[PDB]
Amino acid sequence: RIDSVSQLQNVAETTKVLFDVSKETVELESEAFELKQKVELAHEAKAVLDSW
Amino acid sequence: AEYFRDEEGQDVLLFIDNIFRFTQAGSEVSALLGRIPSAVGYQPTLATDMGLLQERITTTKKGSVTSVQAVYVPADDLTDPAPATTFAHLDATTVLSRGISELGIYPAVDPLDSKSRLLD
C-alpha cells in the first residue's frame, strides 16, 4: 500500500508542472505565427527576382 | 501552361483527365476523314498526336511543366496496343486494378508494377 500511495503523491506533483509547461507551449505558438510571416515575406522577395 | 513556363517563368503542376477520351476522340473522326483505322480500331496517327502533346509538357530553360495524366486501360488488359503505345510516351507509370481497391488497400497501385524511368 505504501508503494501505491507514493505513486499517487507523484501524480499530484506532475499535473502542477503540466499547467506551467502547457502555458509555455501557447506562448511558443504566438512567436511561431510571426515566424510563418517571415517565410512569406522572404518567399515573395525571391519571386520578384526570379521574374525580373 | 506553356505561357506560364516560358513568358511568366513559373513551374506548373499540370493535371489532365482522362487522356483516353483524347485518344478515343481522334479515333472517331479518323475513319470519317478517310484515314482507314490502324492498330485495330484506332487512329493511324496515334504515335505523332501523342508525340506532339508530350513534348510541349517538359522542362526547358525556364519553367518545368510536370503533367499528371489519367489513363484508362480498356477491358482491364494492358497488353492491348492503345495502352502499350502510351506506356512508352510516359515517364513514370503506375498500374492500378480492381482487386487491390476492393481488398481495402488504398490506393490500388501495385507495388512491382509502379515504375519510373526517373528512378536512379
mmCIF file of C-alpha atoms in Angstrom:
data_model
loop_
_atom_site.group_PDB
_atom_site.id
_atom_site.type_symbol
_atom_site.label_atom_id
_atom_site.label_comp_id
_atom_site.label_asym_id
_atom_site.label_seq_id
_atom_site.Cartn_x
_atom_site.Cartn_y
_atom_site.Cartn_z
ATOM 1 C CA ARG A 1 0.000 0.000 0.000
ATOM 2 C CA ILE A 2 2.876 2.312 0.840
ATOM 3 C CA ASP A 3 4.182 1.735 -2.744
ATOM 4 C CA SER A 4 0.779 2.542 -4.413
ATOM 5 C CA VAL A 5 0.255 5.746 -2.284
ATOM 6 C CA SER A 6 3.821 7.013 -3.115
ATOM 7 C CA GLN A 7 2.936 6.914 -6.711
ATOM 8 C CA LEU A 8 -0.337 8.945 -6.062
ATOM 9 C CA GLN A 9 1.902 11.697 -4.405
ATOM 10 C CA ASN A 10 3.891 11.965 -7.632
ATOM 11 C CA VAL A 11 0.656 12.230 -9.878
ATOM 12 C CA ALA A 12 -0.191 15.301 -7.822
ATOM 13 C CA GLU A 13 3.304 16.869 -8.486
ATOM 14 C CA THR A 14 3.385 16.232 -12.215
ATOM 15 C CA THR A 15 -0.083 17.839 -13.114
ATOM 16 C CA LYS A 16 1.116 21.190 -11.391
ATOM 17 C CA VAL A 17 4.117 21.201 -13.688
ATOM 18 C CA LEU A 18 1.966 20.486 -16.827
ATOM 19 C CA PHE A 19 -0.025 23.649 -16.304
ATOM 20 C CA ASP A 20 3.142 25.871 -16.421
ATOM 21 C CA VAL A 21 4.612 23.855 -19.286
ATOM 22 C CA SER A 22 1.449 23.866 -21.327
ATOM 23 C CA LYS A 23 1.133 27.574 -20.849
ATOM 24 C CA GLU A 24 4.752 27.853 -22.199
ATOM 25 C CA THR A 25 3.536 25.939 -25.357
ATOM 26 C CA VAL A 26 0.856 28.627 -26.185
ATOM 27 C CA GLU A 27 3.431 31.320 -25.764
ATOM 28 C CA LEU A 28 5.699 29.477 -28.194
ATOM 29 C CA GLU A 29 2.940 29.110 -30.818
ATOM 30 C CA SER A 30 2.413 33.001 -30.660
ATOM 31 C CA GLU A 31 6.017 33.760 -31.782
ATOM 32 C CA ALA A 32 5.717 30.932 -34.340
ATOM 33 C CA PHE A 33 2.800 32.661 -36.090
ATOM 34 C CA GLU A 34 5.219 35.721 -36.547
ATOM 35 C CA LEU A 35 7.854 33.175 -37.968
ATOM 36 C CA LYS A 36 5.379 31.916 -40.564
ATOM 37 C CA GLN A 37 5.001 35.594 -41.728
ATOM 38 C CA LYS A 38 8.881 35.843 -42.291
ATOM 39 C CA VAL A 39 8.694 32.767 -44.522
ATOM 40 C CA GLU A 40 6.029 34.522 -46.711
ATOM 41 C CA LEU A 41 7.845 37.847 -46.972
ATOM 42 C CA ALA A 42 11.116 36.058 -47.805
ATOM 43 C CA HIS A 43 9.275 33.885 -50.432
ATOM 44 C CA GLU A 44 7.789 36.979 -52.119
ATOM 45 C CA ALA A 45 11.144 38.734 -52.203
ATOM 46 C CA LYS A 46 12.521 35.741 -54.098
ATOM 47 C CA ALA A 47 9.641 35.639 -56.518
ATOM 48 C CA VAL A 48 10.029 39.221 -57.791
ATOM 49 C CA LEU A 49 13.691 38.481 -58.539
ATOM 50 C CA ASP A 50 13.059 35.367 -60.457
ATOM 51 C CA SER A 51 10.502 37.073 -62.647
ATOM 52 C CA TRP A 52 12.897 40.046 -63.425
ATOM 53 C CA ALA B 1 0.816 26.050 -69.095
ATOM 54 C CA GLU B 2 3.228 26.944 -71.969
ATOM 55 C CA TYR B 3 2.554 30.644 -71.098
ATOM 56 C CA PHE B 4 3.470 30.027 -67.539
ATOM 57 C CA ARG B 5 6.533 28.188 -68.454
ATOM 58 C CA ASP B 6 8.242 30.443 -70.923
ATOM 59 C CA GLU B 7 6.971 34.104 -70.594
ATOM 60 C CA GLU B 8 5.714 34.245 -66.986
ATOM 61 C CA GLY B 9 8.556 31.783 -65.718
ATOM 62 C CA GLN B 10 6.642 29.680 -63.241
ATOM 63 C CA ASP B 11 6.506 25.921 -62.686
ATOM 64 C CA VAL B 12 3.231 24.291 -63.465
ATOM 65 C CA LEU B 13 1.905 21.115 -61.900
ATOM 66 C CA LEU B 14 -0.381 20.382 -64.662
ATOM 67 C CA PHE B 15 -3.166 17.837 -64.489
ATOM 68 C CA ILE B 16 -5.184 16.429 -67.315
ATOM 69 C CA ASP B 17 -8.119 13.931 -67.036
ATOM 70 C CA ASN B 18 -8.974 11.342 -68.835
ATOM 71 C CA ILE B 19 -6.494 11.282 -71.636
ATOM 72 C CA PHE B 20 -8.063 8.170 -73.237
ATOM 73 C CA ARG B 21 -11.009 10.496 -74.226
ATOM 74 C CA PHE B 22 -8.338 12.256 -76.260
ATOM 75 C CA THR B 23 -7.133 9.125 -77.896
ATOM 76 C CA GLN B 24 -10.736 7.757 -78.373
ATOM 77 C CA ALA B 25 -11.850 11.088 -79.920
ATOM 78 C CA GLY B 26 -9.191 11.079 -82.649
ATOM 79 C CA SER B 27 -10.268 7.508 -83.455
ATOM 80 C CA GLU B 28 -13.830 8.591 -84.114
ATOM 81 C CA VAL B 29 -13.132 11.358 -86.679
ATOM 82 C CA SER B 30 -10.247 9.306 -88.104
ATOM 83 C CA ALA B 31 -12.391 6.828 -90.108
ATOM 84 C CA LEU B 32 -14.782 9.549 -91.351
ATOM 85 C CA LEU B 33 -11.914 11.845 -92.626
ATOM 86 C CA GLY B 34 -10.923 8.814 -94.798
ATOM 87 C CA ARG B 35 -7.848 7.720 -92.743
ATOM 88 C CA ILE B 36 -8.698 3.893 -92.554
ATOM 89 C CA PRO B 37 -8.138 2.626 -88.903
ATOM 90 C CA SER B 38 -4.840 1.053 -87.810
ATOM 91 C CA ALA B 39 -3.710 -0.933 -84.665
ATOM 92 C CA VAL B 40 -7.282 -2.274 -84.942
ATOM 93 C CA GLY B 41 -9.969 0.412 -84.354
ATOM 94 C CA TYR B 42 -7.581 3.279 -83.683
ATOM 95 C CA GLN B 43 -6.202 6.297 -85.403
ATOM 96 C CA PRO B 44 -3.173 5.606 -87.577
ATOM 97 C CA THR B 45 -1.838 8.937 -86.303
ATOM 98 C CA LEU B 46 -1.646 7.628 -82.682
ATOM 99 C CA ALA B 47 2.159 7.973 -82.252
ATOM 100 C CA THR B 48 2.511 11.530 -83.663
ATOM 101 C CA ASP B 49 -0.543 13.034 -81.894
ATOM 102 C CA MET B 50 0.689 11.701 -78.691
ATOM 103 C CA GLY B 51 4.225 12.775 -79.535
ATOM 104 C CA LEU B 52 3.389 16.390 -80.163
ATOM 105 C CA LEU B 53 1.329 16.596 -76.960
ATOM 106 C CA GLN B 54 4.004 15.113 -74.701
ATOM 107 C CA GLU B 55 6.919 17.232 -75.950
ATOM 108 C CA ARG B 56 5.147 20.538 -75.057
ATOM 109 C CA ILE B 57 4.980 19.269 -71.440
ATOM 110 C CA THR B 58 8.605 19.423 -70.323
ATOM 111 C CA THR B 59 11.320 21.327 -68.547
ATOM 112 C CA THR B 60 13.311 23.805 -70.524
ATOM 113 C CA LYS B 61 15.387 26.908 -69.773
ATOM 114 C CA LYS B 62 12.789 28.341 -67.517
ATOM 115 C CA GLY B 63 9.566 26.567 -66.317
ATOM 116 C CA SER B 64 9.096 22.907 -65.574
ATOM 117 C CA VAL B 65 5.616 21.608 -66.613
ATOM 118 C CA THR B 66 5.051 18.308 -64.997
ATOM 119 C CA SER B 67 1.762 16.792 -66.023
ATOM 120 C CA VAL B 68 -0.226 14.129 -64.178
ATOM 121 C CA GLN B 69 -2.261 12.300 -66.701
ATOM 122 C CA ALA B 70 -5.107 9.837 -66.042
ATOM 123 C CA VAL B 71 -5.199 6.889 -68.402
ATOM 124 C CA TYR B 72 -7.860 4.266 -68.972
ATOM 125 C CA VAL B 73 -6.928 0.747 -69.888
ATOM 126 C CA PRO B 74 -9.824 -0.942 -71.742
ATOM 127 C CA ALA B 75 -11.008 -4.363 -70.768
ATOM 128 C CA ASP B 76 -8.581 -4.265 -67.782
ATOM 129 C CA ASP B 77 -5.909 -5.687 -70.149
ATOM 130 C CA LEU B 78 -2.717 -3.580 -70.591
ATOM 131 C CA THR B 79 -1.110 -5.779 -73.310
ATOM 132 C CA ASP B 80 -3.630 -4.131 -75.796
ATOM 133 C CA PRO B 81 -1.966 -1.641 -78.415
ATOM 134 C CA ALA B 82 -3.635 1.573 -77.209
ATOM 135 C CA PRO B 83 -2.208 1.497 -73.684
ATOM 136 C CA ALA B 84 1.047 -0.124 -74.773
ATOM 137 C CA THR B 85 1.999 2.751 -77.172
ATOM 138 C CA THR B 86 1.316 5.175 -74.408
ATOM 139 C CA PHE B 87 3.410 3.392 -71.822
ATOM 140 C CA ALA B 88 6.462 4.454 -73.902
ATOM 141 C CA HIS B 89 5.282 8.124 -74.041
ATOM 142 C CA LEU B 90 5.005 8.405 -70.279
ATOM 143 C CA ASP B 91 7.832 8.682 -67.843
ATOM 144 C CA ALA B 92 6.509 7.435 -64.589
ATOM 145 C CA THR B 93 3.858 4.786 -64.922
ATOM 146 C CA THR B 94 1.776 3.325 -62.168
ATOM 147 C CA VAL B 95 -0.640 0.384 -62.582
ATOM 148 C CA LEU B 96 -3.953 0.161 -60.613
ATOM 149 C CA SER B 97 -6.541 -2.673 -60.569
ATOM 150 C CA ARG B 98 -9.974 -3.654 -59.278
ATOM 151 C CA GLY B 99 -8.771 -6.293 -56.926
ATOM 152 C CA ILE B 100 -6.447 -4.165 -54.774
ATOM 153 C CA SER B 101 -9.051 -1.391 -54.223
ATOM 154 C CA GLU B 102 -11.656 -3.957 -53.049
ATOM 155 C CA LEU B 103 -9.112 -5.612 -50.691
ATOM 156 C CA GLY B 104 -9.023 -2.437 -48.533
ATOM 157 C CA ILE B 105 -5.554 -1.416 -49.682
ATOM 158 C CA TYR B 106 -5.808 2.333 -50.628
ATOM 159 C CA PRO B 107 -4.628 3.190 -53.256
ATOM 160 C CA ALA B 108 -4.902 0.298 -55.778
ATOM 161 C CA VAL B 109 -1.390 0.996 -57.077
ATOM 162 C CA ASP B 110 0.531 -2.317 -57.480
ATOM 163 C CA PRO B 111 3.959 -2.498 -55.692
ATOM 164 C CA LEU B 112 6.101 -4.049 -58.504
ATOM 165 C CA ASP B 113 4.327 -2.561 -61.450
ATOM 166 C CA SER B 114 4.907 1.095 -60.355
ATOM 167 C CA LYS B 115 7.984 2.017 -62.348
ATOM 168 C CA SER B 116 9.722 5.262 -63.312
ATOM 169 C CA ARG B 117 12.457 5.967 -65.887
ATOM 170 C CA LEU B 118 13.378 8.832 -63.392
ATOM 171 C CA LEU B 119 14.329 6.287 -60.695
ATOM 172 C CA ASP B 120 18.069 6.139 -60.337
#
